Every structure is written in structure tokens, then in C-alpha cells.
Design an enzyme around this catalytic site. Sequence first.
Site, PDB file in Angstrom:
ATOM      1  N   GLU A   1       3.435   8.871  -4.468  1.00 13.18           N
ATOM      2  CA  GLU A   1       4.315   8.413  -3.394  1.00 13.18           C
ATOM      3  C   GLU A   1       5.325   7.395  -3.913  1.00 13.18           C
ATOM      4  OE1 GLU A   1       2.136   7.147   0.054  1.00 13.18           O
ATOM      5  OE2 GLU A   1       1.343   9.149   0.463  1.00 13.18           O
TER       6      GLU A   1
ATOM      7  N   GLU B   1       0.850  -1.186   0.000  1.00  8.51           N
ATOM      8  CA  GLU B   1       0.000   0.000   0.000  1.00  8.51           C
ATOM      9  C   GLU B   1       0.889   1.241   0.000  1.00  8.51           C
ATOM     10  OE1 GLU B   1      -2.284   2.710   2.499  1.00  8.51           O
ATOM     11  OE2 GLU B   1      -1.438   3.058   0.506  1.00  8.51           O
TER      12      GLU B   1
HETATM   13  O1  LIG Z   1      -4.860  12.149   1.841  1.00  7.10           O
HETATM   14  C1  LIG Z   1      -4.070  12.227   2.783  1.00  7.10           C
HETATM   15  N1  LIG Z   1      -2.791  11.809   2.736  1.00  7.10           N
HETATM   16  C2  LIG Z   1      -2.181  11.195   1.538  1.00  7.10           C
HETATM   17  C3  LIG Z   1      -1.530   9.855   1.921  1.00  7.10           C
HETATM   18  O2  LIG Z   1      -1.182   9.120   0.748  1.00  7.10           O
HETATM   19  C4  LIG Z   1      -2.497   9.014   2.764  1.00  7.10           C
HETATM   20  N2  LIG Z   1      -1.941   7.706   3.137  1.00  7.10           N
HETATM   21  C5  LIG Z   1      -3.096   6.877   3.510  1.00  7.10           C
HETATM   22  C6  LIG Z   1      -2.668   5.494   3.951  1.00  7.10           C
HETATM   23  C7  LIG Z   1      -1.670   5.579   4.920  1.00  7.10           C
HETATM   24  C8  LIG Z   1      -1.467   4.477   5.750  1.00  7.10           C
HETATM   25  C9  LIG Z   1      -0.486   4.505   6.739  1.00  7.10           C
HETATM   26  C10 LIG Z   1       0.304   5.639   6.897  1.00  7.10           C
HETATM   27  C11 LIG Z   1       0.111   6.744   6.069  1.00  7.10           C
HETATM   28  C12 LIG Z   1      -0.870   6.726   5.076  1.00  7.10           C
HETATM   29  C13 LIG Z   1      -1.019   7.874   4.281  1.00  7.10           C
HETATM   30  C14 LIG Z   1      -4.477  12.745   4.012  1.00  7.10           C
HETATM   31  C15 LIG Z   1      -5.705  12.346   4.544  1.00  7.10           C
HETATM   32  C16 LIG Z   1      -6.145  12.835   5.775  1.00  7.10           C
HETATM   33  N3  LIG Z   1      -7.329  12.420   6.242  1.00  7.10           N
HETATM   34  C17 LIG Z   1      -7.938  12.891   7.501  1.00  7.10           C
HETATM   35  C18 LIG Z   1      -7.544  11.990   8.646  1.00  7.10           C
HETATM   36  O3  LIG Z   1      -8.932  11.607   8.820  1.00  7.10           O
HETATM   37  C19 LIG Z   1      -9.331  12.311   7.621  1.00  7.10           C
HETATM   38  N4  LIG Z   1      -5.375  13.703   6.458  1.00  7.10           N
HETATM   39  C20 LIG Z   1      -4.134  14.110   5.931  1.00  7.10           C
HETATM   40  N5  LIG Z   1      -3.701  13.611   4.689  1.00  7.10           N
HETATM   41  N1  LIG Z   2      10.902   1.600  -0.853  1.00  5.07           N
HETATM   42  C1  LIG Z   2      10.360   1.192   0.316  1.00  5.07           C
HETATM   43  N2  LIG Z   2      10.879   0.140   0.992  1.00  5.07           N
HETATM   44  C2  LIG Z   2      10.352  -0.280   2.161  1.00  5.07           C
HETATM   45  N3  LIG Z   2       9.283   0.301   2.745  1.00  5.07           N
HETATM   46  C3  LIG Z   2       8.660   1.363   2.173  1.00  5.07           C
HETATM   47  C4  LIG Z   2       9.179   1.878   0.894  1.00  5.07           C
HETATM   48  N4  LIG Z   2       8.393   2.915   0.555  1.00  5.07           N
HETATM   49  C5  LIG Z   2       7.455   3.052   1.526  1.00  5.07           C
HETATM   50  N5  LIG Z   2       7.617   2.129   2.492  1.00  5.07           N
HETATM   51  C6  LIG Z   2       6.780   1.970   3.703  1.00  5.07           C
HETATM   52  O1  LIG Z   2       5.445   1.620   3.336  1.00  5.07           O
HETATM   53  C7  LIG Z   2       4.503   2.248   4.213  1.00  5.07           C
HETATM   54  C8  LIG Z   2       3.405   2.944   3.410  1.00  5.07           C
HETATM   55  S1  LIG Z   2       2.077   3.447   4.459  1.00  5.07           S
HETATM   56  C9  LIG Z   2       1.203   1.926   4.673  1.00  5.07           C
HETATM   57  C10 LIG Z   2       1.417   1.409   6.098  1.00  5.07           C
HETATM   58  C11 LIG Z   2       0.565   0.193   6.476  1.00  5.07           C
HETATM   59  N6  LIG Z   2       0.721  -0.917   5.485  1.00  5.07           N
HETATM   60  C12 LIG Z   2      -0.882   0.584   6.604  1.00  5.07           C
HETATM   61  O2  LIG Z   2      -1.686   0.397   5.686  1.00  5.07           O
HETATM   62  O3  LIG Z   2      -1.291   1.110   7.641  1.00  5.07           O
HETATM   63  C13 LIG Z   2       5.278   3.221   5.086  1.00  5.07           C
HETATM   64  O4  LIG Z   2       5.308   2.700   6.417  1.00  5.07           O
HETATM   65  C14 LIG Z   2       6.671   3.263   4.487  1.00  5.07           C
HETATM   66  O5  LIG Z   2       7.680   3.332   5.496  1.00  5.07           O
END
Ligand SMILES: O=C(NC[C@H](O)CN1CCc2ccccc2C1)c1cc(NC2COC2)ncn1
Ligand SMILES: Nc1ncnc2c1ncn2[C@@H]1O[C@H](CSCC[C@H](N)C(=O)O)[C@@H](O)[C@H]1O
Lengths: 309, 625
Positions: free
Chosen positions: B432, B423
Site C-alpha cells: 500500500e 498505519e
Molecule cells: O486483508 C485485507 N485487506 C488489506 C488491507 O491492507 C487491510 N487494511 C487493514 C487496516 C485498515 C484500517 C482502516 C481502513 C482500511 C484498512 C485496510 C482484507 C481483510 C478483510 N477481512 C475481513 C473483514 O473481517 C475479516 N476483508 C477484506 N480485505
Molecule cells: N500519502 C498519504 N497522505 C495522507 N493520508 C494517507 C496517505 N496514504 C494513505 N493515507 C490514509 O491513511 C489511512 C490508512 S487506513 C488506516 C486508518 C486508521 N488509522 C485506522 O487504523 O483505522 C487511509 O485513511 C488513507 O486515506
Amino acid sequence: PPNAPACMERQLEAARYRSDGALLLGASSLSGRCWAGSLWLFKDPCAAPNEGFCSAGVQTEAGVADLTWVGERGILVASDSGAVELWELDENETLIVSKFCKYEHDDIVSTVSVLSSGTQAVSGSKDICIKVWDLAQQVVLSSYRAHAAQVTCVAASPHKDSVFLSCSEDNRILLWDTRCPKPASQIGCSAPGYLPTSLAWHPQQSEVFVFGDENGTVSLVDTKSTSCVLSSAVHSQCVTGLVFSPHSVPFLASLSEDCSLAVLDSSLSELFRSQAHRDFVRDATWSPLNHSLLTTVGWDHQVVHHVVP
Amino acid sequence: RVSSGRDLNCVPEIADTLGAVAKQGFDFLCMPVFHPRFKREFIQEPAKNRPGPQTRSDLLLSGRDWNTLIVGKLSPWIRPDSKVEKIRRNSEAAMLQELNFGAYLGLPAFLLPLNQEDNTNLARVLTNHIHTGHHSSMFWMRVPLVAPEDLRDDIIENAPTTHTEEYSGEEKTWMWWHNFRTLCDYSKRIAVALEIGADLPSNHVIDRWLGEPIKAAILPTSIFLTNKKGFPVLSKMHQRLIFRLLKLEVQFIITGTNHHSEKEFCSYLQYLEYLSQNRPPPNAYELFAKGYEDYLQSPLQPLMDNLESQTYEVFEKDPIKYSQYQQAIYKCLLDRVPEEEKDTNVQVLMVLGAGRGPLVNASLRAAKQADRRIKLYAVEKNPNAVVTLENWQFEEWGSQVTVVSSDMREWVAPEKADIIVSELLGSFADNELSPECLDGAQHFLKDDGVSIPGEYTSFLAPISSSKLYNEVRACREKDRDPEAQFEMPYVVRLHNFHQLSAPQPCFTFSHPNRDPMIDNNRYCTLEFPVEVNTVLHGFAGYFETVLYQDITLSIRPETHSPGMFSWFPILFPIKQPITVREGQTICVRFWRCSNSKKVWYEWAVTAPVCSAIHNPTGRSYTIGL
Ligand SMILES: O=C(NC[C@H](O)CN1CCc2ccccc2C1)c1cc(NC2COC2)ncn1
Ligand SMILES: Nc1ncnc2c1ncn2[C@@H]1O[C@H](CSCC[C@H](N)C(=O)O)[C@@H](O)[C@H]1O
């Protein structure tokens, strides 16, 4: 007198001589803690504007934008509150009491005139609407949203009870006739002109009138010919009022924001001029008893009597 | 509850009046600072030397009240754009005077009318006032939905209301505001108080006000219909607008006298509250996006930066994303292992970028749902998260999970993978750098191996938001290009805006990618049919993805996965706002660019006019590799 206030507000707005000799005064407070209005009756015209030598008096909720004599005892008032209200006089003529008070306009009611019969009146306001009133029944018979800007002045025709002029900041002068299906008619002297501000019918001919623009130019119009017969640069400021003398061949009194008075020929040439006022000239009224006597009020709280040659 | 106030152009006793309106249940009051009829002369005597006072004293209310309860109103006689020079010069002086008195009192807002086409001089004076002294006062422009000229009863015998329709003509009220706001160079302190007539105009002219900084809506008492029991109400189409306006959280302003005299004045107010009470309640999504509306954020860069603990925690609370991921593996198992092989065949799953490991738990839940056996690798670059993983590992998972504390592009796998689960998606999917990360990792996937997700696609749509354009504009920083903020995307819960065309696909990536010369750079030309006169302020980005087969995730408004707040939309602003006429095509050009160190986007508008190519060479914005 009883109920008559001890003091009168600084900004005198209107002055009207009753046909028997009395003088009606409307004044507003346009500055200070309280913004209000008052109505006054002076059986001694020379006593004005002394609050101690008046015949009757009363306070109104808000300021007085315009007023008119209705008959001999009735006083019709255009209130800042958005209300048109009729004030009934005492049988003794020492008490001024409210007849009706109807909040029908949305913004300040800025101008009022009574139709020839004296049972119906027409009011113009900033809300852009013009309303026809039943004075005896205290209701609005007709509401007309015909203009595009605030209605500056409405003047009923001298004799026809269904005809009146009205001008507004939308540069429109409207000749009205409630008899037609489309009551209003756009009477234009020229296509582009400085905004009309004041209106007065000729007291003899119900086919001619005069209008003063915001530029200090009084123009004489014929309704049928529909062309500016004659005009003159009388004032250096916005022409705020026009009044005809009760004379056989009448003179035109002319009010402005240049604090001056003008009395004019039939051909609109200057006869008299007076800078006796130090603030805006607000109204003019010809004495029924002495035709050559003319009384003017201002915002300088000055009630001045002029002798016209 | 609604925030709303009373409009009055007549105040006798300020003390009583303010009490009276507060008693009625109004939050604030719109009143004049000088008497509306009290014309003042500044140039020629004797009127010039009028003895004071010029208005009532500031002492009549507490500072507390002036700051909170009172909204000033420019005296209606002040006309800076008059044909008459004397009136022009007096209005100038008068306007400055009144605006200064407003600022002196410290009023939160001050009303000014847009009631004609020409407001050039009115703008200059206000602009000059804005750049004189230091104050935080707001300015509300009173502009009506329909021009008073286009509302008049057709009762002038010789000047009839032209019965024919004019698309542009009926939008003239917006063009007044547009000219005025442009002259004032998009000041954040100039907003709209939208006046609503009795007759609503066509739907298109109502819509142009989308994206506009509407702070207040003005409702004349007259526009209210009366019902079966003498109560003020509104039509169905008027209700529509009110509901639209409530979502935009404007203040309401009641103007004019009570025309339903038989009942009290708070009746108009009661109905407004009643309409706010009845509003369709906030969904699962809106209860999460509450404070984030039109709030600009920098895009995340989880490659070059490690994500903070709470960041993970918040995004781990998504009710749908992990449920969707659980299913997408659940289907892939049943397909890869036949029923007769459920004990002889153990699958090798690799969670690439495991985070704090919810996709590990989701992989484990997918197994004990499909009754199949799996070996797990939890690869993570963020060493701080790896601490959480190795703790989950020791306490709970055991030997089944093999935690790997490295980058996927770098990791040398002991064995190849059956399925890689990742993800790494942003708001624009590929932003990303999910393409690049999985590319350096697909070498240790088996030749028949499955990648989750299989594909993803970015979408774009043109937006009009004078509100969001000003937010970006306000992002100028010292020690960098003074326009850099326009050349970078922002994650934002788009709110006060207008989608000008249908979202179309932009960039697509597939995994695995067996193309001989693997390339992730792109160039895409898009064309958007637009059918309204509008002003383009940028492009809204969304994405869709295919996890496995029919199991998909989307933030694209048409196909949005319900309740999923994990992604807000992205915004690609443009430096100069482009005028778009009804029936024209917006042509936009996006490029995905990269070198060995960093990946970035470049964009441009080619039609109807050309913009500058934005963020060239990634000078203003890059995502690091
Ligand atoms: O769209 C946003 N961020 C773009 C990122 O690609 C979102 N992903 C989503 C999946 C994910 C999982 C684990 C760690 C980080 C992330 C970041 C965003 C949304 C938001 N949502 C509010 C929190 O509750 C609504 N806040 C601030 N940023
Ligand atoms: N090139 C790379 N190698 C290893 N890990 C990576 C990477 N690019 C991103 N990541 C890791 O992948 C994660 C994306 S966010 C998703 C986090 C978790 N699977 C969830 O859904 O809650 C981040 O924690 C980031 O550290």
C-alpha cells in the site's frame, strides 16, 4: 399357483435343469418403474416362459444377477442388493419360501457357485470380495479380498470341496485352495490378455478348465502345464457363459453378447450355432433326461430348446 | 450439522427408496440412472434394436427432487478406456447417453470412477459432453486414497504384495486425478469424491489432496470399527482426516450395507454428526473470516482511491491492532520524557493517515495512561474521512488535535514531530506504499524523532492449490490481456491449499531512513526446500511489523497476532502450474519496481523450471503514487 406372481419380468438371467427334469428360472427387471427379480419352477420345460403354466413362483426384493441349484430343493441367489440368499422349496413343490438372506457384500453380488459337498458355497461380487458360506449355518466362514476389480465369475471345482476358480476385471484368474495358507494362486494363460469373463471346469478331469474372454475367445487351460493349450475365436462379443454337456465325451456350450449360441468340440471346433435369440444370451442348461436337448434363456424373454447333433 | 447422503447401487422402488433414505436422515441419494447390470448395445444387431423403455421415467419424482436429492452414477460396465475396440465404442455412446440423461433430469451432480491409470478416453468423452449444450451440472470423480491393487490381502501364493515402500508408488492415486483433470483443462465442473479405505496410507499421500477441489468424501460402512456396546465408530487417525475434511466443508457419502445389523442404519450418521458436534469451536479469527474463505479480492489502493465509510468501520473493529498501537505509543512516551519532566515537556504526535481517527483516540489513551502531555496532528488525504475527523475534533477532542486535510508528502508542517504514527500497511506490508508515503513525510520529523512503526517485513511461501489456481483462471475479463489476472496479487483468506515450504522474509523497510540516496526498489532471491511431490500454483504473502520495541504485529502464521482479522494473506499467482518433485528446491525471484508515477511488483520462478517474468513494466498491475 398360490404366491406365484401373475407376471414375470422381461430380463431372463439364468436357466438350470434339476437332475430329475424340472427347470429353474431366475429373471430380473432391468428397466421400468420397479427393478426387481423373480424365481420360477417349471415342471413342464416346454411351457416356459409362460407364467400360467408354472409349478411354483415368488418375487424377490431386487434383481437376480446369478443363481444356482443347491441340491434338489434349495435355490441360491446372488441379489443386486448385495445379499446372498437361499430359497427353500415346498414339500409339495408349489411354494418358494426364503430360507436366509444375508447382506454381507457391499456392492452387487454378481456370481455364485456351490462347492461339491453342497453345504458350502462361494460368492463373487463387484465389491471385489469373494466369500465362503456355510449354507446350513447361514454365515460367512471366510472373506477374501484378493482381486483389484469386480469379480466376474466364480466356479467351484466339481469334486474337491476346497477348490474353485475365480476371474475378475483385474485380468486375474485365480485357482483357489482353502487348504493353503495363501489360498489364491495366480493362474495365467498369457501375461497380457483380454479380460476373463466366464469359467467352466471340465466335468471329468479336475485338472483342466475353459475360460472365455471379453473378446469372444474361448481358451482351454491345463492347471499343471500352465499354458494355453488351445483357443478359438468363437464369438464376436464378450463370452458370458460356458457350460459342458453331461456326455461321456462332453461338448461345450458357449454364450455371448452377440446373441448367438455355440456348441464346441473337445478341440473347440464349431459344431452347432443358433441366432434364435434377438437379445443377449444369458444362460445354458443341458437336459438330464435328453442329453441332446439344450435350453437357453435371453433378455428377449425367450426360452429356447436346441437339439444338438 | 453435516451435509451427507446415501450411496446405493441397487434401487428397486425409487419412490420407497428415496423415502427410506430420507427417513434415515440423509440429505441426498447417490443412485444409478440406468440399471447397473443392464448393458446396452449401440452398434451391431440384433442387440442394437432392443425395444424400450431404456430406463425408468422422469415422472417418478418431482423436478424439485431431481434438482436437489439425486446424484447420478455412471453404469459400472461403461469402460471408455477398454483394450477392446467394441467395448470402447459402446462405452463412448453409453457414457454420452447416461451423461445426457443426467443433464436432462437436471441432477446437481454425477459420479464417475477413476479406478485405473488410463482414463484418457473417459476424459475426452466427458470433456466433449461438457462443451455440448448449456447446463450447470457438477461431476464428482470417485478416486480412492489407496488403489484397490495396493489394498488386497496378501493371499496370492505366487504374487505377493511387495513389502518394500515406494514414495511415488503409494501416491499413484493422486496422479490419476491429476492426469484426468489436466486433460479436462481444469474444468470448474469437475471435482473429487475421495474414497477412504479401511487402512489409511502414510501421511504424505493423504496430504497431496490438499488444495484439491474435494466436494465429497466417501466412507464405506466396513471401515467403521465397532465398540464395547455394538456401535459403529472410527479410529483416531480416521477422526483426524474427518476433522480435516470438516474444515474443508465437503459432503459425506456413506456406501455399502450395514455390517452392524443389530443397530439401525442412522448409527453411522449419528457418529458423523457427533464428530461434527465435538469439533474444536471457531476461534475469534475464524468467526470473522467465515464467508471470506478462498474468496479472491483486488488489493486496496488507498492512495489513488478514497476508502468507503463502511470499510473504515469494519477494520476499526479490530480487538488487537489499536490495543497494540496504544501500547506502542505508551512505551515511547515513558522513554522520551523522564518523570521529572511530565509537566514541562509536551510531545508532538503526528497521526499520518488518521482515517476516521481511532489512532487519534489511541494516542490520547496512551497519554492518560503514561500521564504525559501531547500535541496532536491528524493528517488525512481522504476528504470524506476528514469530515468525520473535524466532527470528532469539534465535538470531543478540541484544540489538542489539529486536523490536517492533505497528503503527507505534500503537507508543510508548522513544526517538526516528536513521533509520527502511521498505519499504511497492506497484506504484503509495503504494497500500500507505506515506504513512499513516510519518505515524503520524514523531512518534518525531528532528528531524534521516533516513527511508528519502526520497521516491517514481507514474507513469502510457495503454495499448492488447484482450487485457487482455478479461481484466478476464472478472472479473465474482456478488453484486456487474456492472462492479466495471473500477473496481479490477490488478498484472500487462503483455505483449500498446501504450504509447500516455510515462510521466508522478502522485503524490509526501516523508518526513519537516513540513507543518503533513499531507495525503495528491491530484488530478492529466495530458495524453498520442498519435501513432497506437488504442483506449485503460486506464492502466499504475509507480513510482520515492529511498532515499538517488542510491541509487534504479524499475519505470518507462525507469529500471527491472535484475534487480529484486519489482514488476510496475499496471493501472487503464476501463469502455468509447475510440477515440484519431493526433495527439490523452489527458487523464486521478486522485484519491487517503481517510477515517479507508480510502484509495482515483478516475479519469476527460476527452479526447478523457469516461468515467464510476471507483470513486467507493471503492465497488468500497478499501485499508483
Ligand atoms: O486483508 C485485507 N485487506 C488489506 C488491507 O491492507 C487491510 N487494511 C487493514 C487496516 C485498515 C484500517 C482502516 C481502513 C482500511 C484498512 C485496510 C482484507 C481483510 C478483510 N477481512 C475481513 C473483514 O473481517 C475479516 N476483508 C477484506 N480485505
Ligand atoms: N500519502 C498519504 N497522505 C495522507 N493520508 C494517507 C496517505 N496514504 C494513505 N493515507 C490514509 O491513511 C489511512 C490508512 S487506513 C488506516 C486508518 C486508521 N488509522 C485506522 O487504523 O483505522 C487511509 O485513511 C488513507 O486515506
